[PDB]
């Protein structure tokens, strides 16, 4: 062929997760009888307008809109929170880990 894939770009789903494209909020966590969380005030919350996620695939954007609607607040902004650690980026890393998995399950099956 006139070449034919000789470069370095063949990717279905993402892994990078652009923190600054998203919204971040740390927090302290309120809960009346949930987990342990006595004084460890290190929660990560992440918000993004899913429909504006040019970094997500078209078929996956509209998936998260529906299939993860329960994480959407109403506005089509997807909001979720993940906390278990004293560290900043560790809790935030789990937030982004779900976001990747939420994209995987919307993109195609693989193993699971």
Swiss-Prot record:
PTM summary: Methylation of glutamine in the GGQ triplet by HEMK1.
Signal sequence interval, chain numbering: none
Transmembrane regions: none
Record PTM N5-methylglutamine, positions in chain: 35
Superkingdom field: Eukaryota
Subunit composition and interactions: Component of the mitochondrial ribosome large subunit (39S) which comprises a 16S rRNA and about 50 distinct proteins.
Family designation: Belongs to the prokaryotic/mitochondrial release factor family. Mitochondrion-specific ribosomal protein mL62 subfamily.
Name of the protein in its database record: Large ribosomal subunit protein mL62
